[PDB]
Point group: C4
Chain length 140, copies 4
Amino acid sequence: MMVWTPVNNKMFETFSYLPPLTDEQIAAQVDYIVANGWIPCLEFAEADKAYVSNESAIRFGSVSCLYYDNRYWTMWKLPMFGCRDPMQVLREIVACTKAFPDAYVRLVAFDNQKQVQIMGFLVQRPKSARDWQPANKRSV
Amino acid sequence: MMVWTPVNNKMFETFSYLPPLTDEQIAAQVDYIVANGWIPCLEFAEADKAYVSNESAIRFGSVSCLYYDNRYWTMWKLPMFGCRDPMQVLREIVACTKAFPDAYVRLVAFDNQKQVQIMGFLVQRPKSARDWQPANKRSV
Amino acid sequence: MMVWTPVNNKMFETFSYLPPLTDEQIAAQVDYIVANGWIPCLEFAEADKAYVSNESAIRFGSVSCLYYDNRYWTMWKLPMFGCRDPMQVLREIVACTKAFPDAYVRLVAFDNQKQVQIMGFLVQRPKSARDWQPANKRSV
Amino acid sequence: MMVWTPVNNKMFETFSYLPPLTDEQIAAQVDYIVANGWIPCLEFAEADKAYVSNESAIRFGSVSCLYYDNRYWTMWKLPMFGCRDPMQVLREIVACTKAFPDAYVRLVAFDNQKQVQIMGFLVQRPKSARDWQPANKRSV
């Protein structure tokens, strides 16, 4: 019987329960975006703005239902409309992480027919982050 | 006239006003669980999640009555259903404290007829805790 | 034209706008308590509990009017009922400050006919307090 | 395509999107105040009181609309009524920044016919401020 640790074991939505994505695995996800005609986009946030919080609810009456701060991140340039080249997306990941080496960075893609984000996963976390576990240390 | 100190004098419910439990005293409490047929279970929490607090009430209307965060701790494995062996409980205390050496750890027992926790006391506090007094420094 | 400083210029109610009380000045205030038949008492608080705050209002509906945390301090022993000797009060100030050398300590007096505190002033602040000005540095 | 940075890029209302004002540029703004017959005034605030916040809203019902802490700063002396000399304003800037070298200081001017502040801009920020970007580092 192994025990799932509650300590410093924060997650990051899709794919965060798998082993960290290799460069080949990321490339494959990017091919999937392009093959489906979705719109790639990068978003980023400093460590203090990375996880959902409640601080703005201090200003509210009884209307906090499904309100959370830090759902929005900051857009890196613009969504890559008309992009049909996976290398272009990989180059923007490099450019974004270079400009913001200490930020959380996530890759997302949009479907404009449904008007919804259709994919998303973390591609960088700050090296100073101490609030997460490697796969083999998630249970003890 | 001695003065009960308000400074760094936090307590931990049942038995926290007595001298710290010896290993023999813990064993005796464990025998009491087994003799009564109750279900032993261990729970633990990191220092930041150990004491009752109010942070979630920021999301509330006028409904904070008997709401507190940090009442729930994290379960170590499962409650030990059918356990009639005190040595088994002692071995789980050892295993739990070893896996989480910096956590607060409490031993509890359940009665399934009343469906309520029927006993509970702290069995470990982190070595770095500075918010509590030894028995002879509780008053000055 | 001198400018009253807003920075690190916290005050402590009665007499805090005067030069700090000498031992002779404190003795005189104590004589005043005794001459009037009032009940002397000492109260103390650690630095974090010294000034009025709002943290408990997170639990409230619209009822925060004239609610503040940290108005209560901690009683030193009991109010000195029947005390008609100023030296006894001075000895308790010494004893209280010795047991809590890093606390704020105030002397108060009660009138039991009106049932209200009738006098009060600070008799010790922690040496580590940096949030207050000397009389000659209160304006610049 | 350059990306506007969200990190440590706080601004300070009027003129904060231009290059920092030179002494000659400040003098020109001051001439503008005097030429129009407006009332010059200086205000200042320590770093913790410089930007708009919400802390007092913890005491509120549903009435936080257009309530913010830290809109008021501290007045330096009095508004300079009748002042028709730009050198006088410049001398008060010097005197204010000297007395409060670690404070944010802003120059404002009042129109008493409209009864409203008619101009305002930052004239000093603390040297220890790390929450702002130079013009050439505002986008990456």
